[PDB]
Amino acid sequence: SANSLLGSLRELQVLVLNPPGEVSDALVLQLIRIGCSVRQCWPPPEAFDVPVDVVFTSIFQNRHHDEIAALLAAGTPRTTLVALVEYESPAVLSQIIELECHGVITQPLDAHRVLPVLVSARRISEEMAKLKQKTEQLQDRIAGQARINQAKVLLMQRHGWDEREAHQHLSREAMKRREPILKIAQELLGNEPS
Amino acid sequence: SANSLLGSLRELQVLVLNPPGEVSDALVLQLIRIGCSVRQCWPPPEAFDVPVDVVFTSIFQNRHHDEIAALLAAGTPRTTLVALVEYESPAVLSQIIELECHGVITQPLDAHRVLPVLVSARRISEEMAKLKQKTEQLQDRIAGQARINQAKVLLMQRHGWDEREAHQHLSREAMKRREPILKIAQELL
Amino acid sequence: SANSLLGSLRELQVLVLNPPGEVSDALVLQLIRIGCSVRQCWPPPEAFDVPVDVVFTSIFQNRHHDEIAALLAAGTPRTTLVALVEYESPAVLSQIIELECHGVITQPLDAHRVLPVLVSARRISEEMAKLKQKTEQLQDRIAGQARINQAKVLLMQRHGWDEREAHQHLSREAMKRREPILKIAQELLGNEPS
Amino acid sequence: SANSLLGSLRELQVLVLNPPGEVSDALVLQLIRIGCSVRQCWPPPEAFDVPVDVVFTSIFQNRHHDEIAALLAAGTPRTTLVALVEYESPAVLSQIIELECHGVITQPLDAHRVLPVLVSARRISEEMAKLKQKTEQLQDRIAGQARINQAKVLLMQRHGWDEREAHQHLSREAMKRREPILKIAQELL
C-alpha cells in the first residue's frame, strides 16, 4: 500500500556502501532525517553481518567492481539497490544494468533526490521480488511433480503395481515418516536421471 | 543484454506527457541528444494513436492524474513510466506509488539526470514484463505436463504398456497428425 | 575372462533367499560343492547385513513379493540374481521380468542346473552392470557440463566478464578450495533452475 | 513391457541351430506350442538368409563352434542366444562364456525349461541392446551440447548478446533453414 510503504520507512535498515567523505555524510544525514536506520560501510565486506533492507552503492571500475557485484549477489531477495551514478557512459550504465539496481541517484547528490528515489526503488524491489518468487514457486512445483511422477512409474515397474497402488505407497510411506512425499520419491529415485 | 539494451535506445518511442513549457522543452531536447524518437503531448489523450515505449509525466493534483492513470492502465504493459517529481510529501509520493512508476527524476530537472534514469527504468519494466511472461509459460507448462502424464498412465494401464511405450505412442500419433503432444493427450482424456 | 570368471567362483558370497526345506538344502549343498560361500535366508530381511554377490530367490505372489522386490532393488549394482521358477504363466514370468533376473532355474531343481546357470548369469550381470555404469557416467557428465555452463553464463552477466574470465574464476575458486569445479557452480548456482 | 514382451513371443523368429535328432525335435515342438515361428538348421550356415530373433544351439568341440561363433558375431546383435549345455566342466563353460549366451538350458532338456529361459534371455538381450543405444545417444548428446554452447558463447561475445539472445538467434535461423540447431552451431564454429 502507499500508506503501508510510506509508514514502513523508519523500520528500514539502510546501508551506504561508499568510501567515507562528503557524498557519504550527506547521504547518511538525509536518511537519518527521513528516519531510516542507517550505516555506512567501506571497503566492501564479503558478506553483511547484519540484516539489510536497502543498499546505496557507487559504481567502480577497479577491484571494487567484482567485490560489490559478489557481495550484492549474495544478499536477501528483497534487498532494494540504488546506484550513485557519476557517468552516463556505456561501461558505467552496463554495470548498473548488471547489478539490477531498482533506482539511481545522479551525482552530485543533494538531499532532495533521496526520498523520491528510496520510496520508488522500494516499491519496485517489492514488486519484482514477489514476481520472482512466484516464478520460483512454479519452477519448484514443476520439478517436484516430475520427480514424484518418475518415482511412481519406478514403483509400477518394480512391483507390478498400477498407478493407484504406486501413489498409495508413496503417500503411506511419506505420511508415516514425517517427510514430504517428494522426499520419498528422491530417496527412492536416483536414476542419476531427469 | 546491457549491450543490447543500450544499443536499442534510438528505436525507443518516447512521449513527454507534460504541459508545454521549459521543463518539457529541456526534457525533449535531452531525449533528442540521446537519440530516441520523442514526442510531447498535452492534454492527456484517451488512447495513444501511435505505439509508445516510454512515457515521462509529472504528478498533478487535478483531473490529469486520473486521465494519465487510466491512459497507462489500458496501455501496453511494456510502456516504461518515469515521473518528474517536485515534492517529497506523502500525497505526491502516494501518487507515484499508485501510478507504479519504473523510475523518477526529482526537480529541478537537468540533462545529467535523464539517461541513467531512462536506462535503469527501461531495464526494470522489461524485467517485470519477462517475469510475467515466464509466469504464464510455467502455469501452462505445469498444466500441460499433468495431462501428458495422466494420458500416459491411461495408455500404460489400458494397453499394458510401460512409460517409454506410452511416450513413444503419444509422440508418434502427435507427430503424424501435425499437432501438439498435449492435444493428443487431452483427446485421450 | 572365461578363466577369471571360472577362477573367481569360490570367492562369491551367495545367498539362498527361500524358505527352509528340501529345495533350499539341495541348492545350498550344491553351491557348497561348487565351493561358493553360501547362506540361506528366510523371511526376507529389509536389507542384507553382509555383502552379497549372487541371490537365488523364489517367486511369490503374496506379501513376500513386495518384500523381495524392495530388498533386491536396494542391493549393489553387481548383484547377480537367479530366479527359481515353478510356473511359466504370465503373472509369474512378468515378475521375473520386473525383478530383472540374470538367469532362471526351473523347478524342481537338481544339482546339474546350478553351475551352468550361475556362471552364465554372472557373466550377464557383469556385462550389464558395466554397460549401465557407462550410461550413468555419460548422464552425470552431461548434467555436470550443463551446470558449469550455466554458472559461467551467470558470472558473465553478474560481473560483465567474458567467458575466459568466467572460466578462470570458477577454476581458481574450485582449485583453491579443494572442491570440484562443479561444486562451485552448484554453490554459486541455485537458479532453482535447470 | 513385461506384458508387451510376453505378448510378442508369437512374432519371434526362432532358429534351432542343432543337429537333427530327438533334442532338436523336442525343442522345436515346445517352441511351436509356445507359438513362435521356428526353424531348425544344420550344418551352421555363413549368414542367415532370413531374419532371426532367437537362436538355440548346443556346445560343440569341433568346427561348428567357430562357425556358430562367427555366424552370430556378424549377425544382428539383438539376436537372443540360448545354449543347450550338458557338461559343467571348464572347457565347455568357457565356450558358453566366449559365445556370450543370454541364457542356458542344462540337459536333458524337457518342455518345462524352455519358456522361462526364452523370456528371461530375451529380456536380457533387449536390455543390453537398449543400454548400448542409450550410450550412443548420450555420446552424441554430450558432443552436441558442447557445440551448441561454444556457438552460443561465440554469438554472445561476437554481438554483445546475452545467453538468451544467443539461444533465440540459433533457434530462429535453425528453424528457418529447416535444419538441426547443431548444424547452425557447427556452421558457426
Q: Are A96 and B120 in contact (CB under 8 A)?
A: yes
Q: Are strands A54-58 and C13-17 parallel, antiparallel or unpaired?
A: unpaired
What is the helix (H) or strand (E) element at residue D36, kind and residue range? none
Contacting residues of B for A127, CB less than 8 Å apart: 100, 128
Note the Cα B169 to chain centre separation in Å.
Answer: 40
Q: Does D1 touch chain B (CB under 8 A)?
A: yes
Best CA proximity match to A60, nearest among A82, A94, A90, A92: A92
In C93-152, the residues whose Cβ lies within 8 Å of chain D are 93-98, 100-104, 106, 112-113, 115-117, 119-120, 123-124, 127-128, 131-132, 134-135, 138-139, 141-142, 145-146, 149
Q: Å from D181 to nearest chain C CA?
A: 17
Q: How far is CA B9 from CA A83, B16, B31, B48, in A?
A: 20, 16, 10, 20
* Rounded CA separation A150/A185 (Å): 8
Query: Which residues lie across from A38 on neighbouring strands?
Result: A14
Q: Are D124 and D5 in contact (CB under 8 A)?
A: no
Note the Cα B132 to chain centre separation in Å.
Answer: 8
Instruction: Quote the longest CA-to-CA distance of chain A.
Output: 75
Helices (H), chain B: 2-7, 22-34, 63-73, 90-99, 114-159, 163-174, 181-188
Contacting residues of B for D4, CB less than 8 Å apart: 160-162, 165
SS3 sequence, chain A?
A: CHHHHHHHHHHCEEEEECCCCHHHHHHHHHHHHHCCEEEEECCCCCCCCCCCCEEEEECCCCCHHHHHHHHHHHCCCCCEEEEEECCCCHHHHHHHHHHCCCEEEECCCCHHHHHHHHHHHHHHHHHHHHHHHHHHHHHHHHHHHHHHHHHHHHHHHHHCCCHHHHHHHHHHHHHCCCCCHHHHHHHHCCCCCC
Q: Does B162 touch chain D (CB under 8 A)?
A: yes
Query: Which residues lie across from D55 on neighbouring strands?
Result: D15, D81
In A7-66, the residues whose Cβ lies within 8 Å of chain B are none
Around Cβ A5, how many Cβ atoms within 10 Å? Answer: 16
Cα A7-A13-A17 angle, rounded to 5 deg: 135
As a residue count, chain C comes to 194
* Rounded CA separation D103/B184 (Å): 41
Strand order in the sheet with B54-58: B37-41, B13-17, B54-58, B80-85, B103-106
Q: Are C177 and C184 in contact (CB under 8 A)?
A: yes
CA torsion, ordered B175, B179, B185, B188, to nearest 10 deg = -100
Cell numbers at residue A135, please?
516464478
* Rounded CA separation D115/D35 (Å): 11
Instruction: Map out the domains of chain A with their CATH numbers.
Output: 1-127 (3.40.50.2300), 144-188 (1.10.10.10)
* Rounded CA separation D22/D44 (Å): 18
* Rounded CA separation B89/B59 (Å): 12
Q: Are B28 and B38 in contact (CB under 8 A)?
A: yes
Q: Alpha-carbon torsion B3, B7, B11, B15, what sign?
A: positive
* Rounded CA separation A174/A168 (Å): 10
Given resolution (angstroms): 2.2
Residue with cell 524518437: B37
Around Cβ D61, how many Cβ atoms within 10 Å? Answer: 10
Cell numbers at residue D77, please?
546383435
Which approach determined this entry? X-ray
